[PDB]
Amino acid sequence: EVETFAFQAEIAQLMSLIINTFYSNKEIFLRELISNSSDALDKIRYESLTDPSKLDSGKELHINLIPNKQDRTLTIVDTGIGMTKADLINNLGTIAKSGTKAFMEALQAGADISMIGQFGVGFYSAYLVAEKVTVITKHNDDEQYAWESSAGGSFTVRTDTGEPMGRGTKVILHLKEDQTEYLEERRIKEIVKKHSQFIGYPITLFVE
Amino acid sequence: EVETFAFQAEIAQLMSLIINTFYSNKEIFLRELISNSSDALDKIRYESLTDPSKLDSGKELHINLIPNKQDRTLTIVDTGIGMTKADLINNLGTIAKSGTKAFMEALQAGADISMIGQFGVGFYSAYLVAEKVTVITKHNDDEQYAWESSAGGSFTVRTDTGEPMGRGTKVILHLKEDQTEYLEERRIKEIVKKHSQFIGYPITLFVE
Numbered sequence: 219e220v221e222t223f224a225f226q227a228e229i230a231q232l233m234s235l236i237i238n239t240f241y242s243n244k245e246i247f248l249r250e251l252i253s254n255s256s257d258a259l260d261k262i263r264y265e266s267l268t269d270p271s272k273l274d275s276g277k278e279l280h281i282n283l284i285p286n287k288q289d290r291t292l293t294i295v296d297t298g299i300g301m302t303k304a305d306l307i308n309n310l311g312t313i314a315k316s317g318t319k320a321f322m323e324a325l326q327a328g329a330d331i332s333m334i335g336q337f338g339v340g341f342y343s344a345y346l347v348a349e350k351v352t353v354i355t356k357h358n359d360d361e362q363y364a365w366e367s368s369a370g371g372s373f374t375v376r377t378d379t380g381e382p383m384g385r386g387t388k389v390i391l392h393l394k395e396d397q398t399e400y401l402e403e404r405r406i407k408e409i410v411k412k413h414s415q416f417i418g419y420p421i422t423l424f425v426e
Numbered sequence: 427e428v429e430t431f432a433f434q435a436e437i438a439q440l441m442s443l444i445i446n447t448f449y450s451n452k453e454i455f456l457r458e459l460i461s462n463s464s465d466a467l468d469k470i471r472y473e474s475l476t477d478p479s480k481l482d483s484g485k486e487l488h489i490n491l492i493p494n495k496q497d498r499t500l501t502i503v504d505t506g507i508g509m510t511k512a513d514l515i516n517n518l519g520t521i522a523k524s525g526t527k528a529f530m531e532a533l534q535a536g537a538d539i540s541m542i543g544q545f546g547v548g549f550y551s552a553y554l555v556a557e558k559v560t561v562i563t564k565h566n567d568d569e570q571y572a573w574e575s576s577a578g579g580s581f582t583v584r585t586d587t588g589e590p591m592g593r594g595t596k597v598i599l600h601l602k603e604d605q606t607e608y609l610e611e612r613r614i615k616e617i618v619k620k621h622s623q624f625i626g627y628p629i630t631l632f633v634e
């Protein structure tokens with residue numbers, strides 16, 4: 219069972235704008251996703267301050283970056299709070315409709331695409347580099363789900379039956395043919411060092 | 427009934443460091459508090475996407491800045507999610523103990539105090555300019571509480587019986603004798619324009 223959903227009109231337009239604007243500084247996608255992981259990691263850590271069983275699904279709070287050159291995927295895995303099915307449908311937990319409005323109007327008064335994360339919609343920067351994004355998520359209060367979209371106005375949700383993760387979110391980037399520099403160790407390292415050097419959780423860059 | 431609580435040791439040390447370091451760029455306090463308001467405003471907006479009665483305690487989502495020259499207070503009011511009593515005691519909803527560790531170690535490898543908000547503890551920047559900070563908060567799931575601290579290792583909590591706010595958080599800054607420029611309209615305007623120009627909620631600077 220796969221369910222198919224329409225993007226709200228504003229989200230579809232933000233994704234078209236991300237896909238269609240000439241904008242060379244694409245590397246900021248990784249900063250945004252890490253920062254989103256970091257936020258999710260903060261949330262489960264906060265919950266666990268008063269209830270240490272929240273961490274029964276996994277005690278370690280970390281971020282992994284996994285390139286795969288065969289598959290043409292870069293995967294960002296965190297062991298954060300995860301997302302419920304309701305959260306995934308509701309724009310991966312964001313206030314994306316208002317965030318898009320704030321971002322469209324910032325881009326009128328002198329903003330560029332790099333500032334997307336100031337508007338709460340930094341997830342969608344995945345579409346700077348990826349043709350398809352698959353989200354695998356597990357929250358304590360729910361089952362494991364996969365969200366998927368190649369943009370074009372719709373996303374799918376299904377329950378994920380394969381590889382149990384325990385708790386957190388994996389963002390799989392199926393990269394565009396011309397964006398494979400983001401699979402090279404050197405380049406991922408440089409970007410993580412540039413933009414994500416003060417993240418409060420260990421980031422492990424896997425090797426192939 | 428006033429209860430008195432000890433700051434966790436790490437928080438007490440961060441507050442001593444905020445109070446005691448020579449550091450001229452104090453104005454960043456306002457950016458941090460607005461941004462904290464903005465986060466709180468995002469949260470009640472998200473909740474209301476699936477349950478519009480969350481906004482029964484007030485429909486408008488905004489930030490007010492209220493200087494008072496008589497009282498020597500600058501007040502930041504939002505109509506965000508608010509905070510429960512448990513949230514206030516637990517470091518005003520932050521992961522402050524780990525955030526302090528990440529921030530102390532950033533300040534070893536080339537960071538300055540302006541980057542406090544990258545570590546989730548930007549609230550405590552209030553102590554750059556204030557000798558006492560009073561937090562009035564109301565969350566839907568709880569009563570109105572006042573938190574207060576002049577630093578020095580302890581904070582108080584009491585239920586607030588005066589001026590019902592409905593929902594949100596008011597941060598009252600009782601300013602240091604030498605920090606009154608932050609009560610001048612011109613100066614608050616300049617700072618809000620410098621650092622908080624892309625906030626997605628209206629910010630109203632009150633006049634006296």
Ligand SMILES: COc1cc(O)cc(O)c1
Pocket residue numbers: 251254255258298300301309310311312340341387389
């Ligand atoms: C904004 O939606 C996201 C939630 C997560 O837990 C991780 C992301 O990369 C995006």
Ligand SMILES: COc1cc(O)cc(O)c1
Pocket residue numbers: 459462463466506508509517518519520548549595597
């Ligand atoms: C980090 O604690 C805060 C919570 C709020 O709702 C508002 C703040 O200024 C700080």
